[PDB]
Amino acid sequence: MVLYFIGLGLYDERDITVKGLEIAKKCDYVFAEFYTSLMAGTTLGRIQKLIGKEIRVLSREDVELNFENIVLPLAKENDVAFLTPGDPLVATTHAELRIRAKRAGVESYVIHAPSIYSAVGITGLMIYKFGKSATVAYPEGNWFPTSYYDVIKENAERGLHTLLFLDIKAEKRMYMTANEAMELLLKVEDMKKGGVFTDDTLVVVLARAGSLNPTIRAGYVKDLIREDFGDPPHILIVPGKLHIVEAEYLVEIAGAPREILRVNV
C-alpha cells in the first residue's frame, strides 16, 4: 500500500540517506530510474549490493507512460521503493507521479537526499543570491537554443547568481563539460552581443559534487575555458556581483585570482 520516492544523492552509493537506505531494505520491490540523471561515482551493481535487493531499472517510457502499470500495481499490496538520483521531485517531472499514486489509491512518501541545487553552497556563493536556473543544451541540426543566455542576463542584472545545468544524454552517458558550455556561451554572446558572457566574465565550476574531492574552480572565462576540471558531472555558475565574503571564499578555496576582490565586488 506504500510507495517510497527515495533520493540517491549526488555522486556515489553512499550519498543516499540512512533513512532512505533502511526504508529501501524493508521494501518488497525496488525500482530505480537513471534517465533524468546519472550517479557518476558508482554503478547499479554497487548500489544493488548496498541495498541488498535486486533493483529493476526503468526507462523514461516505462515511467512517463507505464508507471501505473509497472510500479503502482505492486505498491497496492506491498511496500515499493522508487529510487532516483539527487533529491526526488527536484528538476524532474516525477511530481505528477504522486498524483498517479493518489488516483490508484496508493500512499506515497518522499525521502529526501542532497541535490546539486543545495550542494552548490560549497562554492562559497550565498544560496539566497541565486536567481532563476537554466540548462545549457547542445545545439543540433538547425536548432540553436539560447534561452539560458537570457536567464543569466536577467539574473546578473539584478545582482543574482545563475546556476547552469549542463546538457546530459543519460542513456548514452554523455556529459557536456564546463569547457563546452563556456564555448557555447561565447558563441551565443557573439550572436546576441548583450555583453552577458565574455572572456572577462567570472565563472565558477563545480565538478563531482558529493565526492570527497570535488573540483571547485573560479576565474575568468579566458583562463578557465581550456582548463581540465576532471571527470563529469560538471556544473557551471555565473555569479552576480559577489559579496566580499563570497569573493574571499572563491580566492582562498576555489583558487580564484586576487583580481576578483576588486573587479567583481
Give contact residues for a copy of itself (rule: CB under 8 A).
7, 9-10, 12-19, 21-22, 50, 86-91, 93, 95-96, 98-99, 102, 109-115, 117-119, 121-122, 124, 127-135, 154, 158, 160, 165, 209-210, 212-213, 245, 248-249, 252-253
Residue numbers in the known binding site are 10, 87, 90, 115-116, 166, 209, 234
Say which entry of ligand SAH, Na ion, a copy of itself, none residue 9 contacts (CB below 5 to 8 A, set by partner kind).
Answer: a copy of itself
For strands 107-111 and 168-169, give the pairing.
Answer: unpaired
Which stretch, 23-31, 101-109, 110-118, 237-245, contacts ligand SAH (CB under 6 A)? 110-118
The rounded distance, in Å, linking the Cα atoms of 233 and 253 is 20
Contact flag: residue 36 with ligand SAH (CB under 6 A): yes
Element (H, E) at 222: helix 221-224
Contact flag: residue 115 with ligand SAH (CB under 6 A): yes
Among 24, 71, 83, 166, binds ligand SAH (CB under 6 A): 166
Residue type, 175: Y
Q: Confirm if 237 and 201 have CB atoms less than 8 A apart.
A: no
CB of 25 or CB of 222, closer to a copy of itself: 25
Among 11, 130, 148, 165, binds Na ion (CB under 5 A): 130
Which stretch, 5-13, 90-98, 125-133, 234-242, contacts Na ion (CB under 5 A)? 125-133
**Lookup: cell for 181:** 558550455
Q: Confirm if 178 and 133 have CB atoms less than 8 A apart.
A: no
The rounded distance, in Å, linking the Cα atoms of 80 and 73 is 10
The rounded distance, in Å, linking the Cα atoms of 203 and 238 is 5
| Residue of 223, 169, 217 lying closest to 201 (CA atoms) | 223
Site residues, Na ion (CB under 5 A): 130
